[PDB]
Design a protein around this ligand. Structure first.
Ligand SMILES: *[B]([O])([O])[C]([C][C]([C])[C])[N]C(=O)[C]([C]C1=[C][C]=[C][C]=[C]1)[N]C(=O)C1=[C]N=[C][C]=N1
Ligand SMILES: *[B]([O])([O])[C]([C][C]([C])[C])[N]C(=O)[C]([C]C1=[C][C]=[C][C]=[C]1)[N]C(=O)C1=[C]N=[C][C]=N1
Ligand SMILES: *[B]([O])([O])[C]([C][C]([C])[C])[N]C(=O)[C]([C]C1=[C][C]=[C][C]=[C]1)[N]C(=O)C1=[C]N=[C][C]=N1
Ligand SMILES: *[B]([O])([O])[C]([C][C]([C])[C])[N]C(=O)[C]([C]C1=[C][C]=[C][C]=[C]1)[N]C(=O)C1=[C]N=[C][C]=N1
Ligand SMILES: *[B]([O])([O])[C]([C][C]([C])[C])[N]C(=O)[C]([C]C1=[C][C]=[C][C]=[C]1)[N]C(=O)C1=[C]N=[C][C]=N1
Ligand SMILES: *[B]([O])([O])[C]([C][C]([C])[C])[N]C(=O)[C]([C]C1=[C][C]=[C][C]=[C]1)[N]C(=O)C1=[C]N=[C][C]=N1
Ligand SMILES: [Mg+2]
Ligand SMILES: [Mg+2]
Ligand SMILES: [Mg+2]
Ligand SMILES: [Mg+2]
Ligand SMILES: [Mg+2]
Ligand SMILES: [Mg+2]
Lengths: 290, 290, 290, 290, 290, 290
């Protein structure tokens, strides 16, 4: 049960969009193309009905009114599919490529060995509880301490990231790094765990088209790591083109083949706040844990 | 004390069925054969009296009314024994073959060694408690972490599977894998433990005519395993013909003898939700834990 | 202070028995011999006074009335000493042979080594507490897990065996297997621990003229064990003639000398419920733990 | 501040004794000698004043009235020093020999090594708490389990020995066996720990002119031990002449030199209740723990 | 959103300063230069608005009134940039050199190895909690005990340092010493941990232009350490010129090159109170933990 | 802020002393010299004001009235500096020699090695808490058990030493023995820990001009130790001339050089109560822990 895509496109054109436009005060000043409407449906909603669709159309109209405040214009400003991220932010869903779409409680990390690099996904669940923490996937002691440092940083910054103020005694956290049997260790997934934990707690989905590596200090400083070449090659080979790396590793980028560096967008960071701002979509997509 | 099977058959024909038919609005449109009634008794009830029997007959009649809504028909639609699963679902009891009948808190898993495969039953009890978890049967650390990942997945999906919302602090769980003395390890019983735990918590019995293998991620992804040939041979040899296997192991099926593959029905899965939907009968057969 | 046996015999004949008979509606239909009365005193009571005696006489009379309901008779049905167990069940006390009389919280188990078998008593105390479990007598990890599986089975079946519904958080249990210094291990005392724990919790005494061996699954399945010959010889040598053994060990009975098998009564079991029904006297002999 | 012994003797003769005699109904029927009064002071009181003295004199008079009930007599029954234990029980204090006087929370145990026996004192404190147990003096695991078995036995028999019903969650226990550095192990101080723990909990002092050895089962059975010759020689050499030994060790007594056996009084026991009845004075000498 | 620096300078001159001066009773007696005002903005405030600025100007004026009380003067006392620390204390912020500015919950420690010295930062977070303590960064047992001793000292001196009276059961502490992978051990960061913990709890920032080393006793005595030469060279090389050292290490200062000793200011301490008074700015810069 | 010593001397002579004398009823019967007043200030007070001074003068006057009760005298009894300890007890403060002055929660212990003896200070903090105990300074298991035995003894004797009745669940204790890195072990600091713990709990300062050694039993017996010669030499060399030693070590004193024994005052003890009476000043000098 629900509307077909055709029905959603039509009800948006005929009812939802004109309603949201007029309620935003923008009637006659902005429009959306058919392709824009379909992109909103496909990449910004996931539902049987159209409540979400209507909310997204309202966001577009209100963002239009913001542009109007910056400066008026004559005639119709037409929003096409290519314009949608300007109004709605980073796509929330990617039905054609689901594995790299944003997800609540996950983050894409990078590991290395003497023979090369490996992508690893950090998974975190936040469930009703009492402040317990589980750390699984055969994690070594250094990596476990890294998770603890990330969690403490978040406990000290609940306001900044929109985390529940009482999660420390009403939520249990579980950090898991598949695959289950393979030992893993080291401090370089500090920012990756901070991202996944913050996502799980806030219910804001983390982008999965970005891979990252960096040690985190307790106060949130991003510290240099090893295996830059191997990790970035592994990302590139897996079709990830957006990277987060510590600022103190900038010198190691010279070691990549120019062709690989060419197809990578690298964000250098000094503070974990920069990571969380880049990785976490602004709006929660699931109800609160408790 | 109770009714004989003969008495149950007769009271169903004379009182229970006609009552349920007329209350469903289907008098004159549907009938059941004597063989159908006996199958309901034998495979869908387990009781001294006939309260359960009457409930099952009501289910048949209401399912009839559903078919009527899809499309009316002229004359009598007669439900025979072979038709009963269309109306009542998968048989709940198999008095002739009790060991493969559905059971609350069990699931059929598959293990391997350098010399072949072995069927292993995962047992789970859910009892009044305070959120404690016991893991017994000489389980290694990887297998214990697998149980923890399965449990966390279920804690995060209580609505989806009809689990109690407060089981995390009102229920103790105990996962046991006989036999008691034999060491066991590995991540490949993740879906098997998820099935047994979900069954115990929901009081919905898990089918025991299906054997399964698959690693589970925290978010419920089913991940590939080893020993596909050995495990499937072991299932076949034990007379299990229905298998659940990770989608990522599809390539390993080529290794089975055509004759063995011939007599196996294999369901490939990517998400643990697909497993639980296939394994767990929809209706609970025991009262809630608390 | 109390009555002598002579006084108890006389007060039973003159007051207690005729009172209980007439209150049961059986005056003139049943009688007891002097030897029957003395057996009731000796094997079914343990007290200074005669409250217990009077209760047992009431049980005899009411059981008489039950036989009357099955079918009336003419004249006097006289109950002699040999008839008493038909009316009162298995003797509760054996003053001439105290070591094999039923006891609250004990069960007779059987162990083996490369040189032969050994009887071992499992002792369990249930005391006011908070759900703690102690396991002592130098028990190995497999044997400890066996105790845990037995306890969980009982937690899941409190109604079936008349266990307190809240024992899991109001009672502490202590399982001890003397002698203190000797290491012990293995899963084959699962049914033995289930018996002793159920007895301690229910305050129903367990028979000590029966020796047992069997692994228990979490759902109560009795599983095969080793050392059948050695264990049964050890029982026989110690003057125990009643044995409980897993059904799956039936084939091993062929290995016993015909003369030994001749003097043993062996009960083959598939479910722990069969064990508890055979071992535990129906009526509690001590007040509840809390 | 307090009375001198001379003042206590005189106030007893002139006021306390005649008051207690007449209040007991025994005026003219019983008397005490000066030596008897001094023994009451010295061996049954420990105080600045004479409240305790007066209580003991009342006990003598009431015990006199008990003898009167058994049978009257003509004239004066005069109680001399040698008669005092008949009226007041075992001496509570021994100012001339303080180390063997009864004490709250201690018991005299016996250990052995390849070169001989050793007396060891078991010390137990019962303090306000929450059910915690500390076991110190470099005790091995078997000896620690022995303490646990003794404590559980006492938890199951609070009525029998006059222990507080709620000690399990309002009292912390600490068992210590000096000297601090010397490792100790084994099950043979089970009765010794039961004695010291029961004494500490009940505030009834344990005799220290008796040395003991015996393993305890959970249900209180006293089980045989080793090193009988070495332990009894060690007792004899230390000037202890009263021994408690398991009944099952009776055969080992033959090994002692006739001269040593001559000067030993040995009590053979089968149940820990027999030990506690012999060791613990009937009346508490300190206020309750809570 | 906020004021530009130019706007802050002007609003201070025109409104904030004259208001604070007249409210302090000092109109006509004190003035501030433009450079002084800019230093207040840059080194004593960190904010979008000017509430903090106005507070600091009020502090200057009230400190002026204090000087007036010590002795009046004729004419205008003009406060220039070089005078600001006399009025406002040690600079709170150093925008040009942020890494050595004071920070809440950090302290600069010094370590050594057989090949030289190393600066290490101790990080501490104080978060809502229940009295838990985490110690991470691969710290050895001696170093962990050192943290415990520092924390206990602070628990015993809450009044002295303005710590919350209930932090012991309402706050969790986490001490972390990056980098995550490198093992660290020893007692010589006792004063360093005391500083960082006291800072985190009090929300008073610790100076980071001072490096320190010293063992702490439970009662706060500062005890001598090793590696004085290596540690002080490492400080000097990193551009730290202010050192805290135990008084008992004064003799080791002779070992430094005269040129290095020349550019170091060394504070010798005997008590941790001297350390905390030197390191912690007097006023908190963040709200309380709970 | 406070009074100068000159002002304190004068205000005592002119106001505080005559007030306290007349309020005690001793006007004209007792006097104090200027030197006595200065000793009271220096060795019995530590304060900015004179509240403490006035209290001490009141103690002197009331002690005078006690002497008067023992026997009157004619004329003026003049109290000089040398007399002050007769009236006020052992000096509470020693400004000229602070390291050996009495302190809350410390005690002077003695250790040995194959090459000689060493003074070691036991430090104890009592802080608001919940009954937790920390034991630090790299203490071995025997030494930790010794601390536990000392603490239990104190828990059983709260009335005797003026300890809080509820410290067992409202106070956390921390025992620390510097230096942090050096391993320490053995039972011979039992009395030393009992002293420091009792001091911390009672807030009564322990003398630090006395060094001690002795094992403690749970019931408070002081037991013999080793290294008497080495320990006493170490004390002597450090300028400690007052020693507490077990009575059972009296024979070892013969081994000291006559010259060393000459300058030592040795108190032989059998019970820890004797130690605490000698070590702890009678009046608390700090407020209660909770
Ligand atoms: B990171 O570089 O510290 C990273 C953290 C996380 C993503 C596992 N770890 C690794 O790269 C480690 C090597 C290592 C680096 C630094 C310190 C210690 C160890 N690699 C792995 O753990 C690993 C696991 N599975 C596959 C490949 N590599
Ligand atoms: B699975 O393949 O990970 C499975 C899980 C569960 C059913 C025991 N385990 C096994 O097959 C293991 C081998 C193994 C596989 C992968 C990683 C580690 C270990 N087998 C056994 O544990 C076993 C136990 N008893 C009998 C036979 N095999
Ligand atoms: B059972 O056969 O598992 C039994 C359980 C219990 C009564 C101790 N244990 C034993 O027979 C063991 C041998 C063993 C069998 C199977 C697995 C592992 C070990 N024997 C003993 O523990 C033992 C102890 N004391 C005396 C004799 N035997
Ligand atoms: B008992 O015989 O088990 C006894 C218990 C207690 C009084 C210490 N223990 C011992 O005699 C042991 C030897 C032993 C006997 C049986 C099993 C295991 C060990 N002796 C000692 O522990 C010991 C300690 N100090 C001095 C002398 N002996
Ligand atoms: B301190 O001198 O005890 C110091 C404490 C803290 C700052 C780590 N530790 C060290 O200097 C140790 C050596 C050591 C000294 C004394 C006792 C035991 C050990 N150094 C290190 O731990 C270390 C760690 N990383 C880099 C360099 N040095
Ligand atoms: B005591 O003699 O038991 C004493 C207790 C405390 C003051 C440390 N311990 C020691 O003298 C030990 C040696 C020892 C004696 C007896 C049993 C076991 C060990 N000495 C030390 O621990 C030590 C520590 N640092 C410096 C010197 N000695
Ligand atoms: Mg990484
Ligand atoms: Mg499997
Ligand atoms: Mg067995
Ligand atoms: Mg013994
Ligand atoms: Mg240092
Ligand atoms: Mg010592």
């Amino acid at each position: 049960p629900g509307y077909t895509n055709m029905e959603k496109q039509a009800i948006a054109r005929q009812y939802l969009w004109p309603k949201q436009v007029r309620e935003s005060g923008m009637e006659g000043r902005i429009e959306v193309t058919d392709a824009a409407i379909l992109r909103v449906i496909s990449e910004y909603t996931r539902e049987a009905g159209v409540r979400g669709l209507e909310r997204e159309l309202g966001k577009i109209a209100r963002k239009g009114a913001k542009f109007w405040l910056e400066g008026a214009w004559e005639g119709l400003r037409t929003i096409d599919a290519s314009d949608i991220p300007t109004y709605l932010g980073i796509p929330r869903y990617r039905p054609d490529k689901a594995e790299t779409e944003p997800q609540v409680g996950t983050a894409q990390g990078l590991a290395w060995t003497p023979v090369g690099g490996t992508l690893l996904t950090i998974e975190v669940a936040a469930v009703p509880g009492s402040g317990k923490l589980s750390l699984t996937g055969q994690l070594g002691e250094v990596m476990k301490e890294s998770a603890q440092a990330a969690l403490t940083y978040l406990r000290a910054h609940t306001q900044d990231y929109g985390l529940p103020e009482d999660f420390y005694n009403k939520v249990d956290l579980h950090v898991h790094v598949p695959d289950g049997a393979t030992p893993k260790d080291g401090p370089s997934a500090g920012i990756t765990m901070a991202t996944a934990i913050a996502s799980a707690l806030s219910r804001r989905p983390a982008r999965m088209d970005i891979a990252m590596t960096g040690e985190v200090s307790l106060r949130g400083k991003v510290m240099p790591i090893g295996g830059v070449k191997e990790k970035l090659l592994a990302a590139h080979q897996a079709g990830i083109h957006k990277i987060v790396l510590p600022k103190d590793n900038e010198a190691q980028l010279e070691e990549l083949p120019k062709e690989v560096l060419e197809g990578l967008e690298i964000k250098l960071v000094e503070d974990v706040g920069e990571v969380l701002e880049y990785l976490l979509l602004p709006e929660p997509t699931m109800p609160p844990v408790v």
